[PDB]
Amino acid sequence: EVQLQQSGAEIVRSGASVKLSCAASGFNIKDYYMHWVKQRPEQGLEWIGWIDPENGDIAYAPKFQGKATMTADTSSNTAYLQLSRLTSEDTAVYFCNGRGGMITTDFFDYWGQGTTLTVSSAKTTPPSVYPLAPGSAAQTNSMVTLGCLVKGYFPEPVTVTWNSGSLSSGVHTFPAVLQSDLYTLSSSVTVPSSTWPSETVTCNVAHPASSTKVDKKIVPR
C-alpha cells in the first residue's frame, strides 16, 4: 500500500525558517511529480509549486517565489518544503501531493496527511481554567448552559471533557484560536435545570505539553 507521510507539527518563531518533509513508501518519487499546497485556518487551498524529483525541475507560484524552496532526496525517497522569513501569514497546514502517469498509464494521485506550522515565539505555557456559571437563576424545567474557558496556554492541544467524559450530550467544544502567541479555547454544556446545581458538573482540562491537569467544578455564583 502506497503512503505519503509528512513530518509532525512545527512551531517556529517569526523571522526564522522551517523545513517540512514528505516521505514516500510503496512507490518511487523519481517516477512522479510532487506538489505542495497551503491551507490557512478556515481558508481554502492555495497552490505553492511542483518539483520533478528526478530532474530537479521546479515551478513556483509567483507569491511563493522567495518564500518557499522545494527540494528532494531520491535516495531517501523524500521531498522537502522550506519556508523562509516566517510570519503569522505562514501559519497553516501544508500538504504534499504525489502525482503522475496521466498520459502513459492509470493516473496516480496520493496525498500526505498535512503538516501544521504554527508561527509563534511562545514557550510552553500551562492553561488557566475558568468556570463559567450563569449570572441569573434558571426557570422550572428549562435548560441551563454552563461553560469552561481555557486561556493563555501554548502549544496545542489541550483537551476538555465534562464529568470525566460522562457528560457528552449537550456539549460544544470550540477549536482553539491563537492570539498574541497564546491559545484560547472554550467549551459549553447544556443540562436540565433540575440537574444543576443539584448534581456536580466539572470541566476537566489536560495539557500534555506542560503536564497540567485541572479539574474545575462549576459552582453557582
Binding site: 481554502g44 496521466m102 475558568y130 463559567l132 450563569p134 460544544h172 455564583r221
Partner: protein
C-alpha cells in the same frame, strides 16, 4: 494567473438531491497539447483533499459513479446525481494547464435542515480570572441553522470590537446545526469601569437582534 471562479459558495442539499457545482476560468485552460487540465476535489473536515475528476470528465479510480464532470474550455460543472452523507464537505476545482496552478475558492456542500435559532448564553468573568487581573465575557451561540450569523458586543450601549475572539464548529453530524463562541477579553481594570455587557446576534430566525446582557454590579 488563471483565476478559477466557483459558484455557489454554499450548496445546502437533502440526501438524494442532485447537486451541481460550477467553475469558470478567467482564461482558456485548454493546454497547447490539447488537454484541459481541470480537476475536482472533495475535502472533508480534518482531511486532505481527495481527487474526484481529472481532465474535465474523467472519474478517478475508486470514485463513485454518482460523480460526473463536464465542460467547455472555460465553463465546468461537477454533478452529483444523488448526494450521499459521505459527500458532505468542501469541493474545489483546480486547473493545471498554466503555471501557477490554481484552485477555485471552494463550495460547501452541507445538509439543509429546518431553521434553528441560536441558543444564546452570556457569562461574566469568573472570580478566578478576576483574581489574575483579567476579565473575559463569554457568549455561546449554540445549535443554529443556517450558518450565517453576526455577533456584536456592546458595553454600556456602545459597540466594542477590540479584544473579541470568535470560534465555531462545523455542521453537527447528529442535528445538522452550527455553534459559535465569542469571548470579549478586557483587563480587570477596564471591566470595572463599565456596567452593562451585551452580546447581540443577528440571524435569520429573528427580525431583530437576539440579545443577552448582564450588569457587573448585579
Amino acid at each position: 494567473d488563471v483565476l478559477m471562479t466557483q459558484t455557489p459558495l454554499s450548496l445546502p442539499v437533502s440526501l438524494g438531491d442532485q447537486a451541481s457545482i460550477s467553475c469558470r476560468s478567467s482564461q482558456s485552460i485548454v493546454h497547447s497539447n490539447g488537454n484541459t487540465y481541470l480537476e475536482w476535489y472533495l475535502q472533508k473536515p480534518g482531511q486532505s483533499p481527495k481527487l474526484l475528476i481529472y481532465k474535465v470528465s474523467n472519474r478517478f479510480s475508486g470514485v463513485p459513479d454518482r460523480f460526473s464532470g463536464s465542460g467547455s474550455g472555460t465553463d465546468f460543472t461537477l454533478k452529483i446525481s444523488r448526494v450521499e452523507a459521505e459527500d458532505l464537505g468542501v469541493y474545489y476545482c483546480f486547473q493545471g494547464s498554466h503555471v501557477p496552478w490554481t484552485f477555485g475558492g471552494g463550495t460547501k456542500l452541507e445538509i439543509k435542515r429546518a431553521d434553528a435559532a441560536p441558543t444564546v448564553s452570556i457569562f461574566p468573568p469568573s472570580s478566578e480570572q478576576l483574581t489574575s487581573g483579567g476579565a473575559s465575557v463569554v457568549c455561546f451561540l449554540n445549535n443554529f441553522y443556517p450558518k450565517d450569523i453576526n455577533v456584536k458586543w456592546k458595553i454600556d450601549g456602545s459597540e466594542r470590537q477590540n479584544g473579541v475572539l470568535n470560534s465555531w464548529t462545523d455542521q453537527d453530524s447528529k442535528d445538522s446545526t452550527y455553534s459559535m463562541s465569542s469571548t470579549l477579553t478586557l483587563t480587570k481594570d477596564e471591566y470595572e469601569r463599565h456596567n452593562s455587557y451585551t452580546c447581540e446576534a443577528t440571524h435569520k430566525t429573528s427580525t431583530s437582534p437576539i440579545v443577552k446582557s448582564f450588569n457587573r454590579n448585579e
